[PDB]
Design a protein around this nucleic acid. Structure first.
Lengths: 59, 75, 17, 85, 154, 247, 113, 125
RNA sequence: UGACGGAGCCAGCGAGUCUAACCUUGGCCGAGAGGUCUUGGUAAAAACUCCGUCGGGG
């Protein structure tokens, strides 16, 4: 998932976070992807689309 | 299969047993058709130089170079 | 100074719009 | 010089020789080495040789000059039921 | 169907029927004087100006099969024996002719010598495989018996 | 009578800004009145130059993309001494897809200056040659009729190429420029090189393109613009648009 | 017993020493930048045999190669056929990005001391 | 009808489906003669069932062989297997039995891998 | 245990209406959201066999 976190260090403050999507599937964000500075791998419970918009709740 | 029994390795026809020892390097492991193409090119050379036979020479080569008494380390 | 006069012409047309 | 023997020719044994004049003359040991035929090439001729007797093709007389020239000269060389009746 | 032709640093192979260059040997350093074939027909010679005869198979210009470092003087004439197909004989500018057995390209089998000046031809004789006609440049065609000591002519 | 003062302001500013300094072509972009009904294929329709030239074919890195068997096209083109040095690399489609995958394709975008396919494999090419070249129309692949030989229906078309004729096509495709049709009104065509030849060379080159695109005659290649051209706009790849002939 | 013929080894062409005992198609390639195919064309343009050695080629035929090689465009040569200080600032930028961020978090404060 | 016999030949992951029928003496592999097999050094590895028993016994028969799977070598061990099996299973069917035991004793003394698939199933020690 | 260029032929797992990029100059339409076209830059079966050619590091 791209352009939610700016740096690879910013992801590391947030790993293990219960990400959800519009479609209603859950998941977690696990490791900061390195070779681009922003992105990260995240394991959902089922196959996310391309047309789909992940949202991480926060306070 | 020549690796299974202890002395099954003897009945390999030695021309193959010479090609098998040609692919001994990490640049060369698992390339037999390169090695067979060498021997068929090598056995031609032994004819052109020494008319006799290549395969009589290869047999006569192994008879000469194999040692007769080898030395071992003792405790 | 003619190029910038055109360049400001198209730019000011947007901000009028 | 060159010698060739027992080939398709009226002269059995041929002896050709270069003379550094372009001048290759052909001699024969059966006829007491008398002069038989002569070519003349442009510059002086160093190497000359003939195709052997076992050639079974177009022969060659290849003579080589000092000036860089090779000079090659050569002697070149219905239906089934209708056929059952 | 083929004949070799020497040049400056080049032995070419022409054809019989097409009369054009089939293959070209060019790996020589300096001028190559003589290019004979063996009586078998498989494998040809070439003697250089650096004094090395480099015998290899014909129809294959990329594999110098056997590079006999002959005399340091330039070898003019390298021929194969007509009778026995594995004994080579070269000459040199060193005024010695060397009968090379190409089982052993590192030692001459016999040093055939006694020449006064510039051997630039030798040729073998059909009835005798031991006898070798060797012509100096001083005159004086030498005749040798290679089964003898050979250092003197007969 | 507005052209040169518009165009002098282009070239003068082309020297000053360093971002503007890097680009080396002059486009004219034309907003015709009605929408052009032809959709965008990537078949580049070339226009003729009546007076000047744009490039001799010995000025460009030229890639040629040919068919699969490709030995009839490799060795006829090389030896026949009209096209020995004319092509930079003769490449096969089978040897294009297999060889250049991934990030080598950006280098080949940057290595060659003008790319030309055989016409009968020009359509297969946007999957092979890649989606880099189909950003605009600089390195857009031209096609050459290889053979001077027609395919009759229910008839074997023989394979044969004659390097007089493909030399003749590259001379006819490098001296003049090329447009591409769009479903909308705005289209672009390059007019001259920024330092090969100056303003009165370009100014003659302007009036040919607006004349060839307007004629009802020469129709399948020039009969595109219907009605009247509203405006033409001189600008490079990076500069702003400079108006000329506003009606 | 005379015979006569038409050799000079290492020679200087365009300030470059050209080795004599090799092919001119390859002896010209030791000059900096000129391609192998570029050395292949000029021998064709100057009507010189490709497989000659460099120790041949009289000075008549040498300068005709020189006139083509230093002036290509007058001999129908195709034009294609011719031959980090922003690191150290952004390294200083990126460590100051870390060093500020080492201050804001508490755990990263133990590093440099 | 037409007398045929179908035998299989199998090395690493390559099958070999050799139809053998009475005919004139052509031997095809994948719609191509057997003198055009790819690896060009191992072409005599498939001439073994031709030349071991003698080339006369192919004068009346056809050998249509088609192969898939495997590599360059491990197909050549499949066409030498299915030609040996396809020859020795035509003499027990449509020619004489004493031919077959002459063949099956000929391929055996030379190389038994021609007939039965040498399956190199694993072993745990 | 080379370098290059063609030619030759060889697999086995894999098929969720799902499989996929950024940045930029410019035109036109639209009240706007945006639409559409334009433009340049940056990322992103093999070994094997056969032929042709070749013979210190930055």
């Amino acid at each position: 998932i791209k352009d939610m976190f700016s740096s690879a260090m910013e992801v590391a403050r947030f790993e293990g976070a219960q990400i959800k999507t519009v479609s209603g599937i859950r998941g977690e964000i696990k490791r900061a992807l390195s070779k681009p500075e922003g992105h990260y791998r995240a394991a959902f419970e089922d196959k996310i689309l391309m047309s789909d918009i992940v949202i991480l709740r926060s306070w | 299969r020549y690796a299974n029994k202890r002395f099954r390795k003897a009945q390999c026809p030695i021309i193959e047993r010479l090609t098998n020892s040609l692919m001994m390097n990490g640049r060369n492991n698992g390339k037999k058709l390169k090695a067979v193409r060498i021997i068929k090119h090598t056995l031609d050379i032994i004819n052109v130089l020494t008319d006799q036979n290549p395969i009589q020479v290869v047999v006569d080569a192994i008879t000469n170079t194999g040692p007769r008494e080898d030395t071992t380390r003792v405790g | 100074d003619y190029y910038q006069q055109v360049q400001r012409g198209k730019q000011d047309k947007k901000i009028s719009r | 010089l060159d010698y060739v023997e027992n080939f398709d020719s009226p002269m059995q044994s041929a002896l050709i020789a270069s003379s550094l004049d372009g001048h290759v003359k052909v001699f024969d040991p059966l006829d007491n080495f008398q002069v038989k035929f002569g070519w003349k090439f442009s510059g002086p001729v160093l190497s000359c040789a003939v195709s052997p007797s076992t050639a079974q093709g177009n022969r060659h007389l290849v003579a080589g000059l000092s000036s860089g020239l090779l000079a090659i000269r050569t002697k070149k060389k219905k239906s089934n039921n209708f056929q059952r009746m | 169907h083929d004949f070799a032709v020497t040049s400056s640093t080049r032995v070419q192979i022409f054809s019989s029927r097409t009369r054009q260059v089939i293959k070209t040997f060019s790996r020589f350093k300096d001028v190559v004087y003589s290019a004979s074939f063996r009586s078998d027909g498989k494998l040809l010679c070439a003697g250089d100006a650096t004094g090395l005869v480099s015998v290899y198979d014909s129809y294959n210009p990329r594999t110098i099969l056997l590079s006999i470092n002959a005399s340091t003087h330039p070898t003019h004439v390298t021929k194969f024996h007509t009778q026995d197909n594995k004994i080579l004989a070269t000459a040199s500018d060193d005024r010695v002719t060397r009968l090379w057995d190409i089982s052993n390209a590192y030692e001459p089998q016999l040093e055939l010598t006694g020449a006064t000046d510039y051997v630039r031809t030798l040729s073998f004789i059909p009835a005798a495989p031991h006898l070798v006609a060797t012509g100096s440049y001083d005159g004086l065609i030498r005749l040798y018996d290679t089964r003898s000591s050979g250092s003197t002519p007969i | 009578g507005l052209a040169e003062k518009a165009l002098k302001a282009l070239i003068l500013q082309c020297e000053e800004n360093p971002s503007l300094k890097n680009d080396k072509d002059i486009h004219i972009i034309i907003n015709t009145g009605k929408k052009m009904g032809i959709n965008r294929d990537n078949i580049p329709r070339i226009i003729p130059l009546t007076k000047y030239k744009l490039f001799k074919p010995r000025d460009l890195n030229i890639l040629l993309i040919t068919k699969d068997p490709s030995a009839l096209y490799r060795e006829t083109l090389t030896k026949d001494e009209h096209t020995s040095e004319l092509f930079k690399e003769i490449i096969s489609v089978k040897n294009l897809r297999r060889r250049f995958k991934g990030s080598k394709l950006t280098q080949l975008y940057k290595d060659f200056d003008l790319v030309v396919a055989d016409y009968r494999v020009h359509h297969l090419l946007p999957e092979v040659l890649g989606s880099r070249f189909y950003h605009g129309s600089k390195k857009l692949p031209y096609m050459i009729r290889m053979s001077k030989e027609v395919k009759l229906k229910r008839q074997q078309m023989v394979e044969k190429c004659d390097p007089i004729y493909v030399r003749a096509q590259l001379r006819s495709i490098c001296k003049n420029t090329s447009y591409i049709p769009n479903n909308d009104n705005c289209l672009s065509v390059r007019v001259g090189y920024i330092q090969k030849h100056s303003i009165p060379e370009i100014l003659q080159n302007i009036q040919d393109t607006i004349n060839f695109l307007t004629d009802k005659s020469k129709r399948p290649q020039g009969g595109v613009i219907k009605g009247g051209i509203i405006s033409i706009f001189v600008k490079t790849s990076n500069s702003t648009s400079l108006p000329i002939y506003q009606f | 017993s005379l015979v006569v013929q038409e050799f000079q080894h290492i020679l200087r062409l365009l300030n470059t020493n050209v080795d004599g005992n090799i092919k001119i198609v390859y002896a010209l390639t030791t000059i900096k930048g000129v391609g192998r195919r570029y050395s292949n064309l000029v021998c064709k343009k100057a009507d010189v045999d490709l497989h000659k050695r460099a120790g041949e080629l009289t000075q008549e035929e040498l300068e005709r190669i020189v006139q083509i090689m230093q002036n290509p465009t007058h001999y129908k040569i195709p034009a294609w056929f011719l031959n980090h200080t922003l690191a150290n600032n952004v390294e200083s930028k990126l460590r100051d990005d870390l060093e500020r961020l080492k201050k804001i978090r508490x755990x990263x404060x133990x590093x440099x001391x | 009808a037409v007398p045929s016999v179908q035998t299989f030949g199998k090395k690493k992951s390559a099958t070999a489906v050799a139809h053998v029928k009475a005919g004139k003496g052509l031997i095809k592999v994948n719609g191509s003669p057997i003198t055009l097999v790819e690896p060009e050094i191992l072409r005599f590895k498939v001439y073994e069932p031709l030349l071991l028993v003698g080339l006369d016994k192919f004068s009346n028969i056809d050998i249509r062989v088609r192969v898939t799977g495997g590599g360059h070598v491990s197909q050549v061990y499949a066409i030498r297997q299915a030609i040996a099996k396809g020859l020795v299973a035509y003499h027990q069917k449509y020619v004489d039995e004493q031919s077959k035991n002459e063949l099956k004793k000929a391929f055996t003394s030379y190389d038994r891998t021609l007939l039965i698939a040498d399956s190199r199933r694993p072993e745990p020690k």
